[model samples]
Target: TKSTTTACCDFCPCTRSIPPQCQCTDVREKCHSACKSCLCTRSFPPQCRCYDITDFCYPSCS
Candidate 1:
């Protein structure tokens, strides 16, 4: 993977879902059209960066 970490759709119940992409609308319509709210758990403490996610603020205003 480009990130060297596993990516999954935050919306999907499955953490390691395929496509390695985030899903929007169903979870949060605020997500960007391109990137989904994905997170890599392989990293210590989890490297789920807010910046890495799209529309992080506009939608949920994390």
Candidate 2:
């Protein structure tokens, strides 16, 4: 028998073994706290920015 591993967002209902792919830098920054890091491609990256996440997770929809 084999066991499968899974990961999910503790604050939200997103269930994926891998972190969600996104375009916004903010999204990537926010999810990092929960071990769900996001990847994003940019034509031109930011010149200078703060490297701290103010919030743990993005608020779910109402």
Candidate 3:
């Protein structure tokens, strides 16, 4: 038997079984700033943190 490894997002329950070749980085910065501003403008609680690509929630805004 062979063992498998997976990478998952910290904030969400999503997992990637293998590395992706076409990973993009430009969107992360834009997405992060936008989410932060959205949270701030909405006066969301401090506990409702924003998750970014670094958090492994890529291609998604939280």
How high is the CA lDDT of each candidate model?
A: 0.34, 0.32, 0.32
lDDT for each residue of candidate 3 in 1-62, tens digit (9 for 90 to 100): 78322222223433364552222222121223324222222343323333333324443442
Cα RMSD (angstroms) for every candidate in the order listed: 13.2, 13.3, 12.3
Best by lDDT: 1
Once fitted onto the true fold, the runs of candidate 2 whose alpha carbons sit more than 4 angstroms away are 1-31, 46-62
What is the total number of backbone clashes in candidate 1?
0
RMSD of 3: 12.3
Clashing residue pairs for model 1:
none
Q: On TM-score, who's better, 2 or 3?
A: 2
* Candidate 1 lDDT tens digits, 1-62: 36322232344221244544333333332333334333344544544332243322233322
TM-score against truth, every candidate: 0.19, 0.21, 0.19
So what's the TM-score on candidate 3?
0.19
lDDT score of residue 40 within candidate 3: 22
Can you tell me which runs of candidate 3 are displaced by over 4 Å? 1-12, 15-48, 55-62
Residue-wise C-alpha lDDT for candidate 2, range 3-32, written one tens digit per residue: 322222333422343554322133322233
